[PDB]
Amino acid sequence: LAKRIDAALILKDGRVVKGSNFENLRDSGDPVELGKFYSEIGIDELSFWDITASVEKRKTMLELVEKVAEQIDIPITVGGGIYDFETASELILRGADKVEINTAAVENPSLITQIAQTFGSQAVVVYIAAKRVDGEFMVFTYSGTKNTGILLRDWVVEVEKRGAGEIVLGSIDRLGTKSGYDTEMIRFVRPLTTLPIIAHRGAGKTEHFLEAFLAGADAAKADSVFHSREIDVRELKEYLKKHGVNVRL
Numbered sequence: 419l420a421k422r423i424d425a426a427l428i429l430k431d432g433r434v435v436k437g438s439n440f441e442n443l444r445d446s447g448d449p450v451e452l453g454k455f456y457s458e459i460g461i462d463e464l465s466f467w468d469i470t471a472s473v474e475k476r477k478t479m480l481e482l483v484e485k486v487a488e489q490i491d492i493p494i495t496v497g498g499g500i501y502d503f504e505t506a507s508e509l510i511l512r513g514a515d516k517v518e519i520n521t522a523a524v525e526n527p528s529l530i531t532q533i534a535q536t537f538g539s540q541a542v543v544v545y546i547a548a549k550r551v552d553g554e555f556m557v558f559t560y561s562g563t564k565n566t567g568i569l570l571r572d573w574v575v576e577v578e579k580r581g582a583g584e585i586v587l588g589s590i591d592r593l594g595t596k597s598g599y600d601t602e603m604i605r606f607v608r609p610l611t612t613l614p615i616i617a618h619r620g621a622g623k624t625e626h627f628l629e630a631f632l633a634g635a636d637a638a639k640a641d642s643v644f645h646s647r648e649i650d651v652r653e654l655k656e657y658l659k660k661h662g663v664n665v666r667l
Contacts (some may be wrong), residue, residue: 422637487513556630
């Protein structure tokens with residue numbers, strides 16, 4: 419029940435895409451060091467999202483998960499182009515606490531059930547990328563480019579039914595913006611599911627996290643707004659505690 423503050427790291431070839439601004443780090447593009455630093459200053463969970471599109475993708479993610487598991491103690495999620503049970507299984511066995519699937523879940527929802535059947539629902543995260551299209555929230559796959567024709571309200575119900583443990587709700591209408599999380603979309607989904615809802619996309623300032631939790635989010639995920647140091651994780655948690663939000667300090 420404590421509200422969660424999650425940091426996500428976008429990776430290509432084992433490197434943090436666009437780096438960070440933590441001058442104090444030995445390598446500002448090293449996902450292991452950046453992740454360990456975040457765990458020290460009080461991030462609650464970490465996401466490693468791989469956009470590597472090469473024949474080396476699978477082998478790279480597994481070696482990264484090995485290193486991260488040794489040095490980092492907080493929950494680790496890994497995602498990005500995980501397409502089948504075998505890939506998911508190896509990542510979990512190598513040390514990932516949770517695997518995140520999106521396009522493969524939409525195309526083959528049985529995959530949700532296969533993963534949860536062996537590892538439990540707690541190990542399955544479904545990232546849902548959604549966007550308003552002609553007055554309706556619709557689900558998008560392939561890095562947000564494919565309108566599947568599936569309604570968000572239908573897919574949320576099916577994801578829980580299939581056995582996912584939590585849903586990351588990413589508003590494509592907030593991609594790259596700094597104007598706030600999509601609280602209308604969070605409020606839309608909240609009554610439809612009892613699963614943990616993770617808000618993603620749009621965070622630009624500390625008050626946006628308060629808004630997301632008042633909307634019913636169980637966690638808030640951000641990336642560049644942390645890496646750029648626009649928002650300090652410690653200052654964010656003290657702000658949220660100050661204003662009545664249950665965060666782990």
